[PDB]
Ligand binder design. Structure first.
Ligand code: ZNI
Ligand code: GNP
Ligand code: MG
Lengths: 170, 163
């Protein structure tokens, strides 16, 4: 039938993984903080003229359970690696999330997109160039998003699908 | 140490009463918050609120009586108050401890352990334990799930302080 893509959203607590996912799926913005245990969502979308089904796993940022991420990194096909542009620690955490995915997948070639979220906020501590330079050094796309205004939400998830498709068909 | 009770209901049908000893001897400010929320004497509190997160094997969590969605609640001292102390540990089933969103963010949400949860020691304030009705808390786990979403509405139909 339509192709299913297994996407996994990771990143430090509070960066907006769930706000991004709920914007994509439900078109509304969660202002309140509901820290995630683990949630799964389904949405069909047209990408490049073809309908596909997204299966999205929204993961906990809680640092205490970092050693229980292996199981979902094994099954996920592509990863949205989210930081918040006003939280330098969450940007520093990116390296560690990516390295964990590579380790669990035992691969330097894993579909991923770097996402700089909260771009609506004036408190910016991570510059676009710094994030662009980093993504370039990783060889993956970088997108700035706001779950509040929806800027870049669809583009970040669709770009990840395109990265997975390129990898499956290679 | 004071004792309070919750009369629990499942989709509005009684399930039974759980009572709790509050460790006012060791955590007086935290115990008094939960006591007053249980009686409703400040004009708000747990009556009518639900256990929004139940994860079998670990705990039953509730206490959001402001938003009823797992994000709210408030203490009798303000929306949040400080971690009073971490003297007492999560030693086994029946421990009553405060939920939080990081240091010094106690409100009204709480959890009741259904197992020992040692990795929460030092992070959540333990302030009481189940006295009677632990089997009611066990019975609440029948309605939980892996991520905690519940399959029936588990409510505190009544609550108060026991003499
Ligand atoms: C990695 C998956 N995963 C697990 C977990 C872990 C494990 N282990 C850990 C321990 N290992 C033993 C040492 C060997 C065995 C394997 C197994 N399986 C799981 C679950 C079932 O896999 C889906 C958890 C867990 C907990 C969180 C996030 C993900 C989690 C998490 C997010 S937010 C929070 N924790 C604290 C939360 N804060 C709020 O709700 C804030 C809301 C906003 O402001 C007021 C209100 C809070 O106070 N509590 C009150 C305290 C219990 C706590 N919730 C909670 O729910 O813990 C769930 C759980 C299952 C106990 C832990
Ligand atoms: N201004 C602004 N606020 C945002 C944005 N995305 C999320 N937030 C806010 O930041 C907080 C955390 O968002 P949330 O989506 O829960 O983050 P999370 O990464 O899922 N956290 P966890 O790892 O605990 O599940 C919430 O208050 C939310 O409204 C955004 O793009 N802009
Ligand atoms: Mg989340």
């Amino acid at each position: 039938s339509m192709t299913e893509y297994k996407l996994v959203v990771v990143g430090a607590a509070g960066v907006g993984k769930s706000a991004l996912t709920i914007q994509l799926i439900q078109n509304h913005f969660v202002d309140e903080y509901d820290p995630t245990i683990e949630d799964s969502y389904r949405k069909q979308v047209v990408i490049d003229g073809e309908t596909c089904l997204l299966d999205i796993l929204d993961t906990a940022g809680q640092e205490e359970y970092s050693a229980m991420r292996d199981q979902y990194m094994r099954t996920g096909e592509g990863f949205l690696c989210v930081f918040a542009i006003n939280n330098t620690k969450s940007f520093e955490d990116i390296h560690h999330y990516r390295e964990q995915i590579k380790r669990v997948k035992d691969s330097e070639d894993v579909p991923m997109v770097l996402v700089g979220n909260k771009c609506d906020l004036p408190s910016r501590t991570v510059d676009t160039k710094q994030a662009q330079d980093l993504a370039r050094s990783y060889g993956i796309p970088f997108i700035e998003t706001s779950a509040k205004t929806r800027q870049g939400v669809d583009d970040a998830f669709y770009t990840l699908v395109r990265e997975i498709r390129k990898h499956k068909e290679k | 140490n004071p004792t309070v009770f919750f009369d629990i209901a499942v989709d509005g049908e009684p399930l039974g009463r759980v009572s709790f000893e509050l460790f006012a001897d060791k955590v007086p400010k935290t115990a008094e918050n939960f006591r007053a929320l249980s009686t409703g004497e400040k004009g708000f509190g747990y009556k009518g609120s639900c256990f929004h997160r139940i994860i079998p094997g670990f705990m039953c969590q509730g206490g959001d009586f402001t938003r009823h969605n797992g994000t709210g609640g408030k203490s009798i001292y303000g929306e949040k108050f400080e971690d009073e102390n971490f003297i007492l540990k999560h030693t086994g089933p029946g421990i009553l401890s405060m939920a939080n969103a990081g240091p010094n963010t106690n409100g009204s949400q709480f959890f009741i352990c259904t197992a020992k949860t040692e990795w929460l020691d030092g992070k959540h304030v333990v302030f009481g334990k189940v006295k009677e009705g632990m089997n009611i808390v066990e019975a609440m786990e029948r309605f939980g799930s892996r991520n905690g979403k519940t399959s029936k509405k588990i409510t505190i139909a009544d609550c108060g302080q026991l003499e």
